[PDB]
Design a protein around this ligand. Structure first.
Ligand SMILES: *[C@@H]1O[C@H](CO)[C@@H](O[C@@H]2O[C@H](CO)[C@@H](O[C@@H]3O[C@H](CO)[C@@H](O)[C@H](O)[C@@H]3O)[C@H](O)[C@H]2NC(C)=O)[C@H](O)[C@H]1NC(C)=O
Ligand SMILES: *[C@@H]1O[C@H](CO)[C@@H](O[C@@H]2O[C@H](CO)[C@@H](O[C@@H]3O[C@H](CO)[C@@H](O)[C@H](O)[C@@H]3O)[C@H](O)[C@H]2NC(C)=O)[C@H](O)[C@H]1NC(C)=O
Lengths: 48, 52, 53
């Protein structure tokens, strides 16, 4: 005349903040560039 | 923050100072076992288990 | 010590209660009371960054 209570559940791991994957939606790309312009006696590179 | 029956004392200073475990081991353990959900659990633990 | 003077061995039990000491929450040892008590101990050796050659 005895009884056992069995219990279990699941959790996020101890190091989930160091080793995890991210699922994204990506849209509307925007490109930067870096261009070097020279003429006369000016060199010099700008980021646009 | 931490509570002992009806004490509600700051966790840095328990009412068992000094030698909480040396004076009463079982009472100290029961003291800790019911503040596990209290965010001041670890400093309470540090206070309960230190004395020279 | 205690003496019964009445019956045989195969009727009484020794069940040491001991207490005073936290053990562990291990699936191979039972609980003593249902809603449980639970504690918290910090385990050593955390995970960190290095570089390999
Ligand atoms: C406009 O400016 C850029 C950067 O200041 C000039 O490019 C640079 O030119 C010099 C001279 O050739 C390079 O120095 C040499 O590089 C070689 C690479 O191996 C090295 O072996 C030499 O010892 C020396 O360091 C420099 O690396 C180079 N920099 C870059 C980012 O390319 C360019 O010549 C200028 N344009 C004009 C028209 O003056
Ligand atoms: C080993 O190095 C990596 C890279 O630096 C560590 O990952 C970094 O972990 C920190 C946590 O301290 C992250 O900071 C977080 O930033 C967000 C904002 O972006 C903030 O909201 C959080 O509260 C937290 O402070 C950091 O983002 C993350 N680096 C990257 C690129 O995501 C790692 O923790 C180091 N240790 C290990 C792996 O044990």
């Amino acid at each position: 005349e005895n009884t056992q209570l069995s219990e279990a559940y699941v959790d996020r791991s101890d190091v989930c903040r160091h080793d995890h994957a991210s699922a994204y939606k990506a849209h509307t790309a925007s490109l930067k560039a870096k261009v070097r312009v020279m003429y006369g006696n000016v060199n010099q590179t700008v980021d646009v | 923050m931490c509570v002992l029956a009806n004490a509600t004392f700051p966790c840095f200073q328990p009412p068992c100072v000094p030698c909480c475990y040396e004076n009463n081991a079982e009472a100290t353990l029961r003291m800790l076992e019911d503040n596990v959900d209290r965010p001041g659990y670890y400093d309470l633990l540090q206070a309960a288990l230190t004395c020279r | 010590d205690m003496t019964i003077n009445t019956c045989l061995i195969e009727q009484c039990h020794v069940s040491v209660t001991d207490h005073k000491k936290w053990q562990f929450n291990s699936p191979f040892v039972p609980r003593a009371d249902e809603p449980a008590r639970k504690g918290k101990v910090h385990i050593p050796f955390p995970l960190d960054n290095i570089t390999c050659r």
